[PDB]
Amino acid sequence: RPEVIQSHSIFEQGPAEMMKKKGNWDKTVDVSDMGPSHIINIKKEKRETDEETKQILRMLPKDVSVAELLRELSLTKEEELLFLQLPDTLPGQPPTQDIAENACTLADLTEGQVGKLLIRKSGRVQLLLGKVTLDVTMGTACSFLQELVSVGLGDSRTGEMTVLGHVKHKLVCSPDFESLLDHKHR
Amino acid sequence: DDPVVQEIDVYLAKSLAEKLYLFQYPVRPASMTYDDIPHLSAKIKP
Amino acid sequence: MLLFCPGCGNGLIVEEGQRCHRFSCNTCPYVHNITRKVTNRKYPKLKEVDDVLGGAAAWENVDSTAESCPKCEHPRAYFMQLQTRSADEPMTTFYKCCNAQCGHRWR
Ligand SMILES: [Zn+2]
Ligand SMILES: [Zn+2]
């Protein structure tokens, strides 16, 4: 390999580098409009950030619970499945369930109205679920697929599995410990 | 801060309380859905 | 760049087939034919330029009918624009004036 490589004072033209770079890779063998050569647009490879799946193409901020409920009321009347996490104990008594002040869960209560959900000014959201009001905030934003499915063992050995819909948003309900404590400090 | 918008009633249903499962697919993005794919079997231990 | 199989989620490798180059899984039949130009740019960090232009360098950006500097109101000053990091940065503008009994540096 010749070592004494030679150089010159002249200044490279800007477009001359651009058009040389252009000619090095703009060549395309896309003429093969054939089955093997074709590619399925709905089974592209997964770029790693799941919100950012599209690496090849045909050519974010965070929401808040006041905005989530506003989009599903005014802008779009379509129904949607939320997924919400409640506190470990709701403010109830298990009705005649043979107890001890044990925990109260949604499995113990009976059908009907259970509470009311209030949206306030300045984006505060409360779940009034008795005399007490629980606070509601947005959970971790999942972006993997989630499916809400029924499983029913209608017979001894066989049954039906049914997919009811996809789940997009998570809500977290928590007790407002400041308000509970500001009633009667200790 | 008065409740100027969306006083929403909250109701509770029990008719599916022993039936309803959440399935989730940690490696499959929310846009690629198995809605088209034909399923051949489902197995469960209850 | 890492790209992963929609089926099993193992890591893809690039290989060559009979008509195209393919992204291919090692553990399932899935392949993806590279039909068109695909790219991935690194944009690494360039050298500092701060101590490179000081001391009467070979600047050239001056032109006829160029503006005078704001303090002296004379065109006895150079001005230039450079990227300080990689070329995706919007270029910054800087200028220095050197006159008799007058030394200053401005932005
Ligand atoms: Zn694979
Ligand atoms: Zn000067």
Curated annotation (Swiss-Prot), chain A:
Modified residues (Omega-N-methylarginine): R1
Post-translational modification: Sumoylation on Lys-43 can serve as a signal to mark misfolded Pol III for proteasomal degradation.
Function (record text): DNA-dependent RNA polymerase catalyzes the transcription of DNA into RNA using the four ribonucleoside triphosphates as substrates. Specific peripheric component of RNA polymerase III (Pol III) which synthesizes small non-coding RNAs including 5S rRNA, snRNAs, tRNAs and miRNAs from at least 500 distinct genomic loci. Assembles with POLR3E/RPC5 forming a subcomplex that binds the Pol III core. Enables recruitment of Pol III at transcription initiation site and drives transcription initiation from both type 2 and type 3 DNA promoters.
Subcellular location: Nucleus
Protein origin, superkingdom: Eukaryota
This protein's name: DNA-directed RNA polymerase III subunit RPC4
Signal sequence bounds: none
Entry's family note: Belongs to the eukaryotic RPC4/POLR3D RNA polymerase subunit family.
From Swiss-Prot, chain B:
Coiled coil: none
Localization terms from the record: Nucleus
Subunit structure: Component of the RNA polymerase III complex consisting of at least 17 subunits: a ten-subunit horseshoe-shaped catalytic core composed of POLR3A/RPC1, POLR3B/RPC2, POLR1C/RPAC1, POLR1D/RPAC2, POLR3K/RPC10, POLR2E/RPABC1, POLR2F/RPABC2, POLR2H/RPABC3, POLR2K/RPABC4 and POLR2L/RPABC5; the stalk composed of two subunits POLR3H/RPC8 and CRCP/RPC9, forming a structural mobile part that protrudes out of the core and functions primarily in transcription initiation; and additional subunits homologous to general transcription factors of the RNA polymerase II machinery, POLR3D/RPC4-POLR3E/RPC5 heterodimer and POLR3/CRPC3-POLR3F/RPC6-POLR3G/RPC7 heterotrimer.
Functional note: DNA-dependent RNA polymerase catalyzes the transcription of DNA into RNA using the four ribonucleoside triphosphates as substrates. Specific peripheric component of RNA polymerase III (Pol III) which synthesizes small non-coding RNAs including 5S rRNA, snRNAs, tRNAs and miRNAs from at least 500 distinct genomic loci. Assembles with POLR3D/RPC4 forming a subcomplex that binds the Pol III core. Enables recruitment of Pol III at transcription initiation site and drives transcription initiation from both type 2 and type 3 DNA promoters.
Name of the molecule in the record: DNA-directed RNA polymerase III subunit RPC5
UniProtKB/Swiss-Prot annotation, chain C:
Zn finger (TFIIS-type) location: 65-107
Motif Hairpin in this chain: 88-89
Mapped zinc finger ranges (C4-type): 5-28
SUPFAM superfamilies per record: Zinc beta-ribbon
Binding positions for Zn(2+) 1 per the UniProt entry: C5, C8, C25, C28
UniProt keyword annotation of Aminoacyl-tRNA synthetase present: no
PROSITE patterns registered for this protein in UniProt: RNA_POL_M_15KD, ZF_TFIIS_1, ZF_TFIIS_2
Disulfide partners: none
Source superkingdom: Eukaryota
Keywords, sorted A to Z: Antiviral defense, Disease variant, DNA-directed RNA polymerase, Immunity, Innate immunity, Leukodystrophy, Metal-binding, Neurodegeneration, Nucleus, Transcription, Zinc, Zinc-finger
GO BP term, example: transcription by RNA polymerase III
Gene Ontology CC: one annotated term: RNA polymerase III complex
Recorded family membership: Belongs to the archaeal RpoM/eukaryotic RPA12/RPB9/RPC11 RNA polymerase family.
Quaternary structure and partners: Component of the RNA polymerase III complex consisting of 17 subunits: a ten-subunit horseshoe-shaped catalytic core composed of POLR3A/RPC1, POLR3B/RPC2, POLR1C/RPAC1, POLR1D/RPAC2, POLR3K/RPC10, POLR2E/RPABC1, POLR2F/RPABC2, POLR2H/RPABC3, POLR2K/RPABC4 and POLR2L/RPABC5; a mobile stalk composed of two subunits POLR3H/RPC8 and CRCP/RPC9, protruding from the core and functioning primarily in transcription initiation; and additional subunits homologous to general transcription factors of the RNA polymerase II machinery, POLR3C/RPC3-POLR3F/RPC6-POLR3G/RPC7 heterotrimer required for transcription initiation and POLR3D/RPC4-POLR3E/RPC5 heterodimer involved in both transcription initiation and termination.
Free-text domain note: The TFIIS-type zinc-binding beta-ribbon domain contains an acidic hairpin motif (residues Asp-88, Glu-89) that likely coordinates the nucleophilic water and magnesium to cleave the scissile phosphodiester bond and release the mis-incorporated 5'-ribonucleotides.
Protein name: DNA-directed RNA polymerase III subunit RPC10
